[PDB]
Amino acid sequence: RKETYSSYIYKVLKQTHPDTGISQKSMSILNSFVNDIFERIATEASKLAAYNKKSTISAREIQTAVRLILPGELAKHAVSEGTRAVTKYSSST
């Protein structure tokens, strides 16, 4: 389907410093890495939650996915806000 991420890329670049601009062609680069590391964390999360043969994919296997591929420093502050935002969904009922 016609479906991208580039608008949410643009909202992100605005919730940076809003002074810059998304360029004409790097948003394709941004789309390509967001979906390819999306797909590869999906692959590893699939088979890592498939090795314990548990039916769903959920919290424990995703934080172990997003630690077990990406390297050290951005991994551990990544999983810090991972726990943050997943509580922040449950922050309300």
Place this chain on the structure above:
Amino acid sequence: ARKETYSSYIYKVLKQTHPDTGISQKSMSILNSFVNDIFERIATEASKLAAYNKKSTISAREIQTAVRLILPGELAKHAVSEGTRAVTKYSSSTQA
């Protein structure tokens, strides 16, 4: 105390290719690890390119494509020859 195993069909096909030899347990484990990971990568890219073709069901043309794109040319011509030959044989499903 309950495990799926590969070794049985392995030793019968080993004894039918070559008649008269013996096997060993760790060598049994190395070739059953070989057969399940070669299945593993054909299966992963089979699902991957039956995904990206925007087509909905896995098919023999799709996996003949898959086995062409994963293994090199010598066993490509081999594996496609008995791919077509096996589908000739099981496609021929008659009363006799």
Place this chain on the structure above:
Amino acid sequence: PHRYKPGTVALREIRRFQKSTELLIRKLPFQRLVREIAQDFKTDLRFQSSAIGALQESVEAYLVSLFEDTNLAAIHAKRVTIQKKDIKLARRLRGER
């Protein structure tokens, strides 16, 4: 007394490893060292023994890959030994961090 060249340990030791594929590194010191490097990240880990066999031949395989490439990288430059620039160019071309 019979005596023959220091440096001509080469070919007899070539065959002397090469006929056999038994695991080179001595086992339970290697168990101790993998236990010690593992012991300072997370508690109470054990090993399964064939896991030790797995990581043992993993380090065997990766080391033989390493100094096979430093062997021919040493002969790349008219040199007879391996030295530190050889292993450092191997760790240039490794591609893995």
Place this chain on the structure above:
Amino acid sequence: PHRYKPGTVALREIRRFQKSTELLIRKLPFQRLVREIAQDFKTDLRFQSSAIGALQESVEAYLVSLFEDTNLAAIHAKRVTIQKKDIKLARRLRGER
């Protein structure tokens, strides 16, 4: 007509190109290149502009990687030219095929 020493002019042309990011090989040359390598092993098929542009992008990136680490392998041997044994040692350290 005053033009002084060669060799550091090589260095300013070094920095001249790698400041820039122009697609460095020539277009219809790669066009006829990729047609006349594709048409033979599999039969007459047609191309699209963005696909062929991306595939010589692949060609550029791969071969620039291989000659920079070929340069490192050449300067291993304390030497400043580029010669063939550097290239095939680079191809071999890079995973033969």
Place this chain on the structure above:
Amino acid sequence: ILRDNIQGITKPAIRRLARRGGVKRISGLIYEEVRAVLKSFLESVIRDSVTYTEHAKRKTVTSLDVVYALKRQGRTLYGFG
């Protein structure tokens, strides 16, 4: 028209294309082995190019499919379509 000519005689572009990275003074005879290595790399990418095209069942080529092939050979030239 379809006749074979030799584009293996590409262009001597490497005496600027090796001028993309820190190639010092060059000293030559590299033309034939840079020819060999790039012909190996292009034939490697083009046979799985046409492999997806026969799985595409239409006689053009395209960019999303070329990046599918390009990462499945591992040498993923990322980011074009």
Place this chain on the structure above:
Amino acid sequence: HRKILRDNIQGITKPAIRRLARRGGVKRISGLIYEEVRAVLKSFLESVIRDSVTYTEHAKRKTVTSLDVVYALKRQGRTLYGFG
């Protein structure tokens, strides 16, 4: 109980490193290949124990198998064969 155990990190030594080193093929060694084969088995083995025992602990599991470390070796891209 505390299991305070320090260096075995040099513990395979000059005959051991020379016997693995010539097992690879090289027949002339220089006098300081101690410390670099030290440091590189440090690097490679901490990589494999990090990824392996971290998702061993993902398996709710404080005790390692062998199938976890072979799945980690294939995760790293150096897929070992034949221990399951």
Place this chain on the structure above:
Amino acid sequence: QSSSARAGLQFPVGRIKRYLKRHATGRTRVGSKAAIYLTAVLEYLTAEVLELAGNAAKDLKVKRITPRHLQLAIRGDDELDSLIRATIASGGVLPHIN
């Protein structure tokens, strides 16, 4: 009321629900951990795109053009090992010498 905002942060969750369904294997996936895929994508894309502010004194150029983002993605050694064999369309190389 709105799922990105009932979550709260600034990525969409409703499409990655079925984009995980698009890719899944295990016949079952949870309806509550969309909340972490958006957190993953938030963190990694900000942890590259905020570094693009380091263009400023080296470009004084207001959009984030194609050589330039890789031209500052390189010195993130913590970054380059996440696009390892991956390489740009028309990006350049960080220069150096002997």
Place this chain on the structure above:
Amino acid sequence: LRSQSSSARAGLQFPVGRIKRYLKRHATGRTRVGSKAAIYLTAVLEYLTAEVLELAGNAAKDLKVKRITPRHLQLAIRGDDELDSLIRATIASGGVLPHINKALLLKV
């Protein structure tokens, strides 16, 4: 003579219930034809053979009767036809191929 489709309706030798199981365990979407798929039995048959025939090749070279692992690594590095199928080839206690180089020997 028999009214039983005896699972080799092509005539192959690997278990097809296992092939139906492995296809519905890679299992991405929801409808996946398990009837056609004996054309992957034929590939796992072809390389059963593309290892065991050079097992039979180096079976003479060691004068054994029982096939084992170092001969498995010499057959895993039989040739460039099969190096590349298992790009990372290291099997357990496989050892290496015998190789001196032409460098070190100089008649000294």
